[PDB]
Amino acid sequence: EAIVNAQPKCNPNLHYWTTQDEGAAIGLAWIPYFGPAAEGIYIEGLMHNQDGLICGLRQLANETTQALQLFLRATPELRTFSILNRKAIDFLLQRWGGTCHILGPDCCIEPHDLTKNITDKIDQIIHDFVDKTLPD
Amino acid sequence: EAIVNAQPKCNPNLHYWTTQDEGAAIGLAWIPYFGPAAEGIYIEGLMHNQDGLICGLRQLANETTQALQLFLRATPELRTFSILNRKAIDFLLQRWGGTCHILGPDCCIEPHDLTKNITDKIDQIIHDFVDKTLPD
Amino acid sequence: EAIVNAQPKCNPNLHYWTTQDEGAAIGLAWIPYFGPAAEGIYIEGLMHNQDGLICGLRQLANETTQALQLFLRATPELRTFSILNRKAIDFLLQRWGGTCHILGPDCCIEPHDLTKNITDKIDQIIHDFVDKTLPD
Amino acid sequence: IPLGVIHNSALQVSDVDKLVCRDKLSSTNQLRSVGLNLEGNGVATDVPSATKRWGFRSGVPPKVVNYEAGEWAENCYNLEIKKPDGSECLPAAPDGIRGFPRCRYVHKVSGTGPCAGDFAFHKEGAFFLYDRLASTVIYRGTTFAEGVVAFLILPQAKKDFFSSHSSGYYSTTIRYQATGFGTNETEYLFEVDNLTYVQLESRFTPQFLLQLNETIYTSGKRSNTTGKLIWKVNPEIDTTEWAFWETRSEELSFTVXXXXXX
Amino acid sequence: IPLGVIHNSALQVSDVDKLVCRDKLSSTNQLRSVGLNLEGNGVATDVPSATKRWGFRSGVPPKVVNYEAGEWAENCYNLEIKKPDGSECLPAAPDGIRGFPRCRYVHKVSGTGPCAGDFAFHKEGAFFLYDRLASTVIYRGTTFAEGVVAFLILPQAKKDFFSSHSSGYYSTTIRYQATGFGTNETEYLFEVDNLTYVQLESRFTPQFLLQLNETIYTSGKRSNTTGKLIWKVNPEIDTTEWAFWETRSEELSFTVXXXXXX
Amino acid sequence: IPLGVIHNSALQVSDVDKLVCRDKLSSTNQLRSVGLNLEGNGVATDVPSATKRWGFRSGVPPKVVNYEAGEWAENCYNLEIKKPDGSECLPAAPDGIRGFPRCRYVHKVSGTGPCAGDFAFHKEGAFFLYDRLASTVIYRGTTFAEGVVAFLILPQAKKDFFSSHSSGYYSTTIRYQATGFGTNETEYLFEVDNLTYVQLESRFTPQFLLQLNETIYTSGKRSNTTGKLIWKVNPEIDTTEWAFWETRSEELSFTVXXXXXX
Ligand SMILES: *[C@@H]1O[C@H](CO)[C@@H](O[C@@H]2O[C@H](CO)[C@@H](O[C@@H]3O[C@H](CO[C@H]4O[C@H](CO)[C@@H](O)[C@H](O[C@H]5O[C@H](CO)[C@@H](O)[C@H](O)[C@@H]5O)[C@@H]4O)[C@@H](O)[C@H](O[C@H]4O[C@H](CO)[C@@H](O)[C@H](O)[C@@H]4O)[C@@H]3O)[C@H](O)[C@H]2NC(C)=O)[C@H](O)[C@H]1NC(C)=O
Ligand SMILES: *[C@@H]1O[C@H](CO)[C@@H](O[C@@H]2O[C@H](CO)[C@@H](O[C@@H]3O[C@H](CO[C@H]4O[C@H](CO)[C@@H](O)[C@H](O[C@H]5O[C@H](CO)[C@@H](O)[C@H](O)[C@@H]5O)[C@@H]4O)[C@@H](O)[C@H](O[C@H]4O[C@H](CO)[C@@H](O)[C@H](O)[C@@H]4O)[C@@H]3O)[C@H](O)[C@H]2NC(C)=O)[C@H](O)[C@H]1NC(C)=O
Ligand SMILES: *[C@@H]1O[C@H](CO)[C@@H](O[C@@H]2O[C@H](CO)[C@@H](O[C@@H]3O[C@H](CO[C@H]4O[C@H](CO)[C@@H](O)[C@H](O[C@H]5O[C@H](CO)[C@@H](O)[C@H](O)[C@@H]5O)[C@@H]4O)[C@@H](O)[C@H](O[C@H]4O[C@H](CO)[C@@H](O)[C@H](O)[C@@H]4O)[C@@H]3O)[C@H](O)[C@H]2NC(C)=O)[C@H](O)[C@H]1NC(C)=O
Ligand SMILES: *[C@@H]1O[C@H](CO)[C@@H](O[C@@H]2O[C@H](CO)[C@@H](O)[C@H](O)[C@H]2NC(C)=O)[C@H](O)[C@H]1NC(C)=O
Ligand SMILES: *[C@@H]1O[C@H](CO)[C@@H](O[C@@H]2O[C@H](CO)[C@@H](O)[C@H](O)[C@H]2NC(C)=O)[C@H](O)[C@H]1NC(C)=O
Ligand SMILES: *[C@@H]1O[C@H](CO)[C@@H](O[C@@H]2O[C@H](CO)[C@@H](O)[C@H](O)[C@H]2NC(C)=O)[C@H](O)[C@H]1NC(C)=O
Ligand SMILES: *[C@@H]1O[C@H](CO)[C@@H](O)[C@H](O)[C@H]1NC(C)=O
Ligand SMILES: *[C@@H]1O[C@H](CO)[C@@H](O)[C@H](O)[C@H]1NC(C)=O
Ligand SMILES: *[C@@H]1O[C@H](CO)[C@@H](O)[C@H](O)[C@H]1NC(C)=O
Ligand SMILES: *[C@@H]1O[C@H](CO)[C@@H](O)[C@H](O)[C@H]1NC(C)=O
Ligand SMILES: *[C@@H]1O[C@H](CO)[C@@H](O)[C@H](O)[C@H]1NC(C)=O
Ligand SMILES: *[C@@H]1O[C@H](CO)[C@@H](O)[C@H](O)[C@H]1NC(C)=O
């Protein structure tokens, strides 16, 4: 399933606001007593429709909402933050939550560098450990 | 440790209620304005004692409660949801939270398909790369 | 980056309090109706500056606070518990959140026990599967 | 907190020190929190026997834990208790805390008690089950069930247990009064109407309380006065200890506030 | 809840049953919750068209969800509605719930309505966006935007999208009154001062409301009396359906509480 | 948020860009949040020096973070401050917020101040430590300690640090009054009884405040009148800057509300 925008319009430029968690503020900004007030904790940016992301996103958000709204009904948590962390767990679980059969369709293990460094161990012992008939 | 029911009785049929998080409701149900009210968000089912699960479960829940109650004392979170997600993390951590020594007692890596596809590489080079003495 | 204490003083003995989550209380303690009241749920210990941990810790906590305080501004969660679990996820993600190339700089896979048990398979077939020219 | 897993066709508590790779947790949807009602272990579900398992205590703060799926209950309770001097005894349901969603009979107790304590806990270490929240305490006027929570990992053969895959939900409030609530010396009366109370005993089952409601109503024994009629029943109806999932009255009464008989 | 991922230079919904190892989630910082305003899909942003998408309903409890980054908005709303008999219609903003941080025009509606319901929901299944919290309901006197939340995984080529790497933030409250709020039969007036209301129509854009404010003020049509002057505009100014990101008044008025014209 | 790890027999901040597989996190129990008191870095613990590090501010909302284990404290504070016109200056402790569990001396300050602000923050970027919760602000009448939180990963050699493996907990409230609280121009008096205040200076240690309590009591200098007696001490007792963990009065007084000396 790919995403096709079926909205009346798509505003293809996304002006956004968010919050910097940086760790590296001017020198005292970070102390809350001296800190910016609620209204100016924000950073801003502008992202264009390169690769069609903004139109994609608007439609995705639309699409999402039922699936979300239903999930929200189901929980008695008043304000739900866990969602993302919870996704990231399922992410690891879906790859690592069970024996990983090397070279299976569903294993993330890449043994290519290994097997090179085992074919290079045998080519060694065809030149000396096979050199049993030719002595001195 | 297995679980033995030491209750006065065990009602071996579990009628249950829960909530569907589905994602696929009739078409407008999912909108909360039109949605079922608090009393009818539920689904129901019935599970029998096949493999002794219901009697198992009742006793398990009993057994659990001390271990839980103690945990609840210890946290100053008023309503504790994290419990399950937290279990699932320890699950991954206990298998993946440290170098996985292939073929160790505590590694989930199955290299059987690999090693077949390395014994099949050598049987190849006993028929041609060893064919150095017989020419043309 | 290591940690150097630049405080006026460092009290190098840490008397501490915390809570036992044990699971194994005297026999009724664990029932909250009979339980210790809020003031006596605690355990205590004393840790010395062995390996310089206490002075380390005091400075670390100091150092931490900006990075933390900033993070706290950024979230609209009133009381933030997720922090630790969230760290533990990033921990797994940073090692397992992507194909693990065996023997790469960033793979936690130790194949040493494997490759021994493949060099011991070839030394077998130099003594019999190579024994094609000498019959009976 | 111990975790159920199914090994060798039987549920067991899984042990951390050596969990093993055959086990498979592919998603979070494999973990479930399940709330089992205390009835199902065959505790007495009657109002005076139930109440004996609860007490007031102070200096322990309340804690709430979420569970995902609950048992249909036969018996629930809904307490509104005042101290003698009009004061509220049970704290208001905090925001988000709803009565247990599936009860057959809701024992709605009104009355007064000494209430020597801030909060009301379960004496046996059990929980008050509300709507997908378990609490350590009773909230005022909010339907609950007694029970206990378990956590398990389903195998992905059975991942849809509880989650996915109905002759209908039927409920009935049963009013009561009581004095001396929470001591060893408590009096309960069962309400038929405003002024028509029936003196209450342990052995009386809900079904029979409903037929007694149907007999006083039907046969006209409801107090026509504007004084409190306090009926009583003869100790001449017998049952001889049968749990509710396992598997009718022809008497009359004589008159004597108005502490009669039957 | 479906998750965006970028494959083949295009965003798509990722499907669980066969996600694939080339995909790479190295940290939590790669996951984002993003709140897009409904304007950007080109719904009508005017006050009577906006209001038509909201209704009162009871027995559905409110739920709140956090998102990390929001769109700069053109249009937001701030409702203080009373029922006719002085009663509050919208519940107070719970602790931590702030108005949407970036609005160009805040449509501050005061008025009265029937309000047949406990809470006010979005009829189309959308959310009220506040400060990094989305809610299912409207809170009293708290600025919001209509919109929707998406979740995605950024590739670590683009992990810093939204997070890291400014001609300034300019705002303007627009007061209104209204009667019959939430029915099909509602009257809105736009406030210039205490007693100088203008009758309101759909087609009127904020810019033009501000120039109308600038015309009544400037040209002295503000009621000098101490009665309510209710202006009106001629249907003789035209626009012929142009969204706001895509890309001036010489009339006067005649007099007739004081339901005049222009 | 930086994370402690033990490498080469020394604690260091671990760096994300190249954490390495020898490191081993086997469970969540290996991560700890630890709350260290500011005393232990040797800030002045006296009431007027402590107070100088706090101020009122508005437009910053409060935030709370949980930690798992705290230092036994020598000095804590418990503020109940009113503005001059009887109004409450500090917000009530929210539900779940308890005073710091282990304090030797609780400096209970009552008084009045200008309080030019919604909430009271720590000026140096530190936290108010309560019971397993750190907050950015002071709550009314709730015991706290100043300090800071660190996070670490224990190696599983040491996983039981803090967690698992006692001559007893002894506490003493010390009452004070103060005027002009939170400015540079504030007056503190130390309470012995209702009307027997002692004028307060920086250099006075708790021990010596307790012996001064033991001297005025013992030797009968408690005001027998029903006016406020305001004692003072001679500047003739010396100490010459010794922290509290490192390692007794024969004078009398002359009389002069009743601003005496000693
Ligand atoms: C998990 O599952 C177990 C098993 O059901 C529960 O065990 C119960 O624990 C509580 C303690 O918290 C017990 O309450 C006490 O019971 C005794 C006597 O009880 C008698 O009557 C019972 C009702 O029919 C009956 O089941 C009992 O039968 C068994 O026990 C006796 C030994 O007592 C034995 O001889 C029998 O052969 C049976 O095996 C018994 O005849 C009662 O005296 C206690 O009261 C005193 O102590 C309390 C303090 O706890 C105090 O408040 C009182 O005022 C008084 O001083 C107490 O009420 C209960 O009997 C147990 N049930 C069983 C079957 O053992 C446990 O609660 C479950 N946990 C949870 C969290 O649900
Ligand atoms: C995700 O994105 C989709 C697409 O934009 C949103 O789809 C909208 O869904 C809501 C339902 O919740 C629709 O509201 C209803 O609309 C009909 C008629 O609408 C007319 O006017 C619109 C405004 O300009 C216009 O867009 C419509 O044009 C399309 O639809 C018609 C078919 O109706 C079609 O013939 C056209 O060619 C267009 O494709 C249309 O002309 C209205 O009659 C409904 O009212 C009745 O039903 C409701 C119950 O829902 C009831 O309360 C009323 O009183 C009345 O009985 C209803 O209001 C809206 O039209 C849809 N928009 C589009 C473009 O399809 C969806 O909401 C988004 N989801 C979220 C969560 O934001
Ligand atoms: C982490 O650990 C560090 C180190 O302890 C803490 O550093 C402290 O930061 C605060 C700023 O938030 C400082 O407060 C200011 O201090 C100056 C002068 O302080 C003097 O008196 C101190 C008390 O004994 C003393 O420690 C100082 O000694 C050092 O500093 C000077 C330079 O000032 C140097 O010359 C010395 O040789 C020492 O190295 C010093 O003599 C004071 O003037 C400031 O007040 C002004 O500014 C504030 C705004 O911040 C304003 O509100 C005032 O009204 C005024 O205008 C200010 O109070 C403190 O001195 C620092 N301590 C040290 C030892 O450096 C830091 O707080 C810790 N973080 C946390 C989160 O706990
Ligand atoms: C006791 O029984 C009577 C009837 O047998 C109940 O009163 C009936 O209540 C129902 C439901 O509201 C009505 O449809 C009937 O008209 C009533 N019948 C009579 C004969 O009054 C009464 O509600 C029952 N009380 C309790 C406590 O269960
Ligand atoms: C309507 O316009 C007038 C001015 O054109 C506004 O009143 C001005 O408000 C500003 C900002 O506070 C002042 O600096 C000016 O002195 C005012 N000018 C006059 C001519 O009164 C008024 O605030 C506007 N009203 C609305 C609803 O936007
Ligand atoms: C000041 O000291 C006196 C006693 O030295 C304290 O009053 C004593 O308080 C204790 C504990 O409640 C009692 O057992 C004694 O009987 C009291 N003795 C006398 C001589 O009154 C007083 O509480 C102390 N005050 C402060 C502020 O610490
Ligand atoms: C292959 O593995 C061996 C381990 O025995 C290692 O020392 C060697 O350097 C590897 N070869 C190459 C080319 O990296
Ligand atoms: C074994 O590995 C090689 C990789 O060089 C692969 O192409 C080949 O198909 C594998 N053999 C079988 C039988 O799958
Ligand atoms: C090596 O692997 C084989 C699997 O075919 C196993 O049975 C054998 O015991 C291993 N050798 C040793 C020495 O462990
Ligand atoms: C009791 O009487 C009141 C009016 O006095 C009436 O409204 C109510 O329904 C009656 N309750 C019962 C249970 O009969
Ligand atoms: C309305 O009048 C009041 C005083 O009667 C004044 O304070 C207020 O600013 C006026 N509001 C407007 C919008 O003109
Ligand atoms: C102050 O006097 C009141 C009664 O007037 C008394 O109850 C209280 O204990 C006294 N407080 C102190 C600290 O002496």
Residue numbers in the entry:
A (entry chain B), B (entry chain B), C (entry chain B): 502 to 637
D (entry chain A), E (entry chain A), F (entry chain A): 33 to 197, 210 to 284, 287 to 293, 302 to 310, 471 to 476
Reproduce text from the manuscript describing this model.
Ebola virus (EBOV) glycoprotein (GP) can be recognized by neutralizing antibodies (NAbs) and is the main target for vaccine design. EBOV GP, a trimer of GP1-GP2 heterodimers responsible for cell entry, is recognized by the humoral immune response during natural infection. EBOV GP contains a heavily glycosylated mucin-like domain (MLD) that shields the glycan cap and neutralizing epitopes in GP1 and GP2. We first examined the contribution of two regions in GP2, namely the stalk and heptad repeat 1-C (HR1C) regions, to GP metastability in a mucin-deleted Zaire EBOV GP construct (GPΔmuc).
